[PDB]
Design a protein around this ligand. Sequence first.
Ligand SMILES: [Cl-]
Ligand SMILES: [Cu+2]
Length: 122
Amino acid sequence: ADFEVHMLNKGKDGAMVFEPASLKVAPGDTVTFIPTDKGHNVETIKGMIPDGAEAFKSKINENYKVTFTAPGVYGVKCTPHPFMVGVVQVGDAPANLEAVKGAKNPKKAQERLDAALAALGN
Ligand SMILES: [Cl-]
Ligand SMILES: [Cu+2]
């Protein structure tokens, strides 16, 4: 299955958001990150992807497709915007939940990550 995540200056969750900010996918599914407004990108957060997964980074304004196979949670961020974060989860019972959940980001970033994890049923 293929999914889309858009990058926005403003959403229900406030300034600088991924929409949706959480997505549960099956191994082999893809997500394309599509900027709706200028000035955004996507990249993995340091230490927040599974064993077996590779880090990634897009250019500002670039449509960027990633295939997710390794099970677990994947924290993503936007380089220029500090609060702009999201989580992609592959499978059930992710093994690296604590890497995201137990992290120490600014309050707004951490609350968005934590809400994403809860939305995903963790
Ligand atoms: Cl592009
Ligand atoms: Cu952004």
